[PDB]
Amino acid sequence: VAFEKLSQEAFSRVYVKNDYKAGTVKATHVFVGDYQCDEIYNYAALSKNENGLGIKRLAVVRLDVDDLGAAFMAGFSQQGNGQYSTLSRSATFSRSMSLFFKVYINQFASDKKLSIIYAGGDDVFAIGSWQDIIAFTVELRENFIKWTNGKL
RNA sequence: AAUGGGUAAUUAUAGCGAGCUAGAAAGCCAAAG
Numbered sequence: 001v002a003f004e005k006l007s008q009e010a011f012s013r014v015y016v017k018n019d020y021k022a023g024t025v026k027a028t029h030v031f032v033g034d035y036q037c038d039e040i041y042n043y044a045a046l047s048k049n050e051n052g053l054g055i056k057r058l059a060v061v062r063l064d065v066d067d068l069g070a071a072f073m074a075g076f077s078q079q080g081n082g083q084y085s086t087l088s089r090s091a092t093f094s095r096s097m098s099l100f101f102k103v104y105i106n107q108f109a110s111d112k113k114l115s116i117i118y119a120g121g122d123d124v125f126a127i128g129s130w131q132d133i134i135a136f137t138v139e140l141r142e143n144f145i146k147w148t149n150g151k152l
Numbered sequence: 153a154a155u156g157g158g159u160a161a162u163u164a165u166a167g168c169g170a171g172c173u174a175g176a177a178a179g180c181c182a183a184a185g
């Protein structure tokens with residue numbers, strides 16, 4: 001639905017996607033990772049340079065956090081005698097792994113010629129032109145290892 | 153002095169030993185629906 005079409009359509013709950021404005025809808029703020037720099041079928045012909053030097057290919061990356069449930073569930077018990085194995089640490093860890101992959105991934109794909117098809121929980125699936133997809137995951141992890149101090 | 157004979161050495165030497173351009177394209181399919 002569009003913005004002003006909320007006057008027209010009858011609903012019960014409205015979900016708003018990748019937004020922080022208050023607005024008049026009093027909606028529910030979901031966070032779906034999404035980006036398109038172009039259509040999917042143009043990413044092969046976008047792999048050229050300004051010279052013409054590039055192979056007409058498109059790359060696809062599927063990222064995955066390693067041992068995510070093993071770091072969610074147990075996670076913190078290594079430091080101390082176990083005095084950091086609480087709900088609020090894992091609830092903050094719950095946000096910080098969703099705040100990364102569902103919001104911050106569009107900043108990493110700001111001007112890259114790609115399309116994040118899905119990013120959620122641990123998993124990313126992002127088609128795109130091959131120079132940028134290779135540059136995406138190098139730029140994603142080098143951010144994600146600074147986000148987590150090298151762990152996860 | 154005549155006369156009988158040739159004898160030894162070298163058997164190639166110094167280099168280059170490949171260079172550059174192309175390294176899969178276009179259809180089917182998928183897209184556009």
Ligand SMILES: Nc1ncnc2c1ncn2[C@@H]1O[C@H](COP(=O)(O)OP(=O)(O)OP(=O)(O)O)[C@@H](O)[C@H]1O
Binds near residue numbers: 098120
């Ligand atoms: N957003 C999330 N936050 C915390 N845990 C998650 C999230 N999404 C999935 N999981 C966890 O991931 C587990 C499934 O394993 P998954 O492959 O998804 O990641 P993993 O546990 O790190 O394993 P792997 O190393 O194979 O990726 C589930 O037990 C679930 O609890």
Ligand SMILES: [Mg+2]
Binds near residue numbers: 064068069
């Ligand atoms: Mg996982």
Ligand SMILES: [Mg+2]
Binds near residue numbers: 064122123
């Ligand atoms: Mg997983």
